[PDB]
UniProtKB/Swiss-Prot annotation:
Organism of provenance: Deinagkistrodon acutus
Secreted listed as a keyword: yes
UniProt record, GO biological process: arachidonate secretion; lipid catabolic process; negative regulation of T cell proliferation; phospholipid metabolic process
Feature type site, description Cationic membrane-docking site (MDoS): K112, K117
Region of interest: Important for membrane-damaging activities in eukaryotes and bacteria: 105-117
Tissue: Expressed by the venom gland.
Gene Ontology MF terms in the entry: calcium ion binding; calcium-dependent phospholipase A2 activity; phospholipid binding; toxin activity
KW Disulfide bond (keyword) present: yes
The protein's name: Basic phospholipase A2 homolog acutohaemolysin
PROSITE patterns: PA2_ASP, PA2_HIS
Length: 122
């Protein structure tokens, strides 16, 4: 759910997740996907594409188990769709951390309708 995802983002990045990634670029947070503006935004594109495999569960609402231990995210003993969701969220949080050095404050609160249609299939 958004609760696990936000916690993972906070654990990995130290950033408040909704402030920093709730409206960032063309792909993070509210709205859909569009051509990404930078590496952080690409993380968000990949993550929303990851969620396309979730046919049996709800990425926003459904809770799942994970642990934050030794600076690692370990997805727990979840049902299959929920484990897919966890693993999408984990990869995304790691991606966001990896790209902190190019996080652009000007992109934090972005005009999503100005974004361009992607030509990339998930």
């Amino acid at each position: 759910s958004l609760f696990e995802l936000g916690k993972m983002i906070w654990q990995e990045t130290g950033k408040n997740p909704v402030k920093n990634y709730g409206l960032y670029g063309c792909n993070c947070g509210v709205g859909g996907r569009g051509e990404p503006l930078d590496a952080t935004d690409r993380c968000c594109f990949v993550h929303k594409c990851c969620y396309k495999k979730l046919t049996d569960c709800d990425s926003k609402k459904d809770r799942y188990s994970y642990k934050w231990k030794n600076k690692a995210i370990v997805c727990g003993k979840n049902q299959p769709c929920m484990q897919e969701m966890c693993e999408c969220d984990k990869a995304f949080a790691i991606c966001l951390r990896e790209n902190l050095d190019t996080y652009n404050k000007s992109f934090r609160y972005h005009l999503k309708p100005s974004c361009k249609k992607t030509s990339e299939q998930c």
